């Protein structure tokens, strides 16, 4: 049930966001685009100076008053092909470097840590106060600087698969939006889209992203989603802790299948007045495809000694999930300590480094990063025998893989239904069925996967906002409107791109959504969509 | 008749040889002959089945149907094709062993060495 004191919390909560969200950008923009800056900052350092930023900015708001806040979702920066899970600690610098040494040059963004131009970055990060959630991920291009121009601009824009991708995410973002908002008045809704007095469906949700992501020749990640946020259940870890009641619309490998062929999520629900609402959209480029195939994730593990394949990143993940339904009483008094600490963080996803005390730091100094490892490595050996006793679980490193359909069906499993992956950590992703129509597990599927030599990796774009539909009485001006918390004209302000695709008028749901577009431009008779604003820094 | 004094006629000693043939041995144990069209064309009647040729069945309840070969199992003296399998309603799908001696072969993979395999059974490819 909303209230004047929660929809405070969430605003607080995206302005936080949304000033993170502005300093990483104008960061980036220093180190790579305006080039000022005489060292040039790598993908961890960004992240631990925003995870700082987001905690010195947090500390001066709502101090006691509430039991517990912080960071939600851990400064993650994605390039091209990986679709998630990546923010590493500052200590694994040369790890890195040691475990791809001899590899390939295609992860070389994500190995070095420094970005180069074409570069798809995604920035995700969230702010949680109270366990009220706002989650913000923006995709931005790195460009390279022209010379001869006065004023520092790209020398052209975005072209081909990413600038497909980049386009289909951000105009889904929007008539998504836009659409979410016609639900507080349901007689706006266009009449092709749906009825007059027919609500907002997951199914109609589902079939507006189709056809924007079948417009772009792209495809939907399986990690995307719609759905409801409630107190301390935003979905922080969807693919590992599992929830009782779900409302809200997936994609999936078989709503792929599904999709060709013509605590469960279901696309039967009505998008009702006074709730907070996330979008997250992951758009994998297909141009690189030259036939029919299927989107699915392939996991990063620690280990080089798994295979002998040139293109495959060994990276560890740096963010860990706490269980608290799992209580072992560990043997060493570090990791009895470091599980005093990371009970006190919460049920949000943590970094090792978000544990230190010297963390924040008030004074960027170079004692305070050499104490921040010191106590980093101390943390790693205590954080061994934790997980080894399965107390936390990491979240995983995905990176989006293209399988094509006809090595799938010439494919054969003995097993069919039964096969499942006994060794895995996780319950949850260990017995899943991607294919429930042909009988192919996700360990039959991986092994299909691995043995194509036609199965290669995508870049894939993010959007991710959330929104409040606030009612007659919770809004201001007594009408109902859509309050987007994070995200908009301001921060998520996209790239130089062009795209050689577009929505084909001849369609009666591009039609409705370039009605919704029409009636978003329209501020007073149309769709009401009021903006959380950045908070000033300098 | 054989003439020769080096050559066996005993069974026991024929059935061990067959059974405990090592993998090079098995791959000239597991020919198969060419189609009508494929025999006029080089000239040659059977070759040692290899993994990427296309088959026809020509024996068995499967008689009729055609695909690439899809593994040739040497240690049960079998070879899988491809589109030639049995499902079950879990979804599971197994592939048939068939014995390359009732199958034909239809088209053949070429390469350098199997260019020169026929060519010395006294083939005249193009």
Redesign the interface.
């Given at each position: 049930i909303l209230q004047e004191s929660v929809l405070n919390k969430y605003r607080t909560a995206g302005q936080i966001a949304q000033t993170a969200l502005k300093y990483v950008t104008s960061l980036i923009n220093d180190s790579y685009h305006s080039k000022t800056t005489q060292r040039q900052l790598t993908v961890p350092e960004l992240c631990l100076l925003t995870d700082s930023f987001i905690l010195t900015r947090l500390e001066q708001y709502y101090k006691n008053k509430v039991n517990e806040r912080g960071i939600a979702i851990p400064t993650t920066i994605d390039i091209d092909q990986i679709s998630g899970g990546w923010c590493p600690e500052i200590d694994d610098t040369q790890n890195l470097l040691n475990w791809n040494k001899g590899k390939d040059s295609t992860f070389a963004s994500s190995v070095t840590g420094t970005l180069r131009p074409g570069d798809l970055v995604k920035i995700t990060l969230g702010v949680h106060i109270d366990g009220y959630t706002s989650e913000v991920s923006h995709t931005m291009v790195i460009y390279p600087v022209d010379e001869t121009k006065p004023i520092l601009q790209p020398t052209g824009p975005l072209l081909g698969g990413k600038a497909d991708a980049v386009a289909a995410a951000h105009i889904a973002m929007e008539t998504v939006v836009a659409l979410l908002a016609c639900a507080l008045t349901p007689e706006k809704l266009p009449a092709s889209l749906g009825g007059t007095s027919s609500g907002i469906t997951g199914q109609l949700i589902r079939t507006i992203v189709d056809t924007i992501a079948r417009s772009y020749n792209c495809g939907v990640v399986p990690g995307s989603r719609v759905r409801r946020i409630r107190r301390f259940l935003a979905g922080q870890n969807e693919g590992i802790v599992a929830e009782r009641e779900y409302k809200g619309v997936v994609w999936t490998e078989s709503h792929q299948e599904a999709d060709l062929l013509s605590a469960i999520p279901s696309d039967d629900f009505v998008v009702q007045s006074g709730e907070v609402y996330l979008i997250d959209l992951k758009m994998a480029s297909l141009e690189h495809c030259t036939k029919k195939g299927l989107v699915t994730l392939e996991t990063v593990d620690s280990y080089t000694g798994k295979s002998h394949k040139a293109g495959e990143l060994i990276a560890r993940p740096g963010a860990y999930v706490r269980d608290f339904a799992q209580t072992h009483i560990l043997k060493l008094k570090t990791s009895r300590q470091l599980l005093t600490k990371i009970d006190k963080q919460g049920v949000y996803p943590f970094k090792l480094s978000h544990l230190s005390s010297n963390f924040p730091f008030v004074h960027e100094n170079e004692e305070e990063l050499q104490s921040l490892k010191k106590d980093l490595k101390s943390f790693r050996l205590g954080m061994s025998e934790i997980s080894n006793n399965y107390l936390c679980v990491e979240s995983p490193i995905q990176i989006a893989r293209w399988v094509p359909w006809d090595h799938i069906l010439k494919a054969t499993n003995p097993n069919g239904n039964l096969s499942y992956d006994a060794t895995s950590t996780l319950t949850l992703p260990g017995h899943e069925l991607p294919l429930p129509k042909l009988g192919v597990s996700a360990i039959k599927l991986k092994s299909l996967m691995n043995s194509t030599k036609e199965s290669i990796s995508l870049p894939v774009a993010r959007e991710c906002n959330t929104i409040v539909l606030c009612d007659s009485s919770v809004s201001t001006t007594d009408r109902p409107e859509l309050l987007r918390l994070t995200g908009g004209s301001k921060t998520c302000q996209p790239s130089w791109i062009h795209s050689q695709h577009e929505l084909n008028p001849q369609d009666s749901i591009v039609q409705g959504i370039f009605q919704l577009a029409t009636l978003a431009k329209d501020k007073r008779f149309g769709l009401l969509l009021k903006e959380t604003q950045p908070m000033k820094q300098k | 008749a054989k003439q020769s004094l080096d050559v066996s006629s005993d069974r026991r000693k024929a059935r061990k040889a067959y059974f405990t043939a090592p993998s090079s041995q098995r791959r000239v144990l597991l020919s198969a002959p060419l189609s009508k069209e494929l025999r006029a064309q080089y000239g040659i009647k059977a070759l040692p089945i290899r993994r990427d040729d296309e088959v026809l069945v020509v024996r068995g309840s499967k008689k009729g149907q055609e695909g690439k070969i899809?593994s040739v199992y040497r240690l049960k003296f079998a070879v899988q094709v491809?589109?030639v399998?049995k499902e079950?309603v879990?979804?599971?799908?197994?592939?048939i062993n068939l014995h390359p001696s009732k199958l034909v072969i239809t088209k053949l993979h070429l390469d350098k060495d199997r260019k020169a395999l026929i060519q010395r059974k006294g083939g005249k490819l193009e």
């Open positions: - | 899809s491809d589109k399998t079950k879990n979804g599971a799908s197994v592939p």
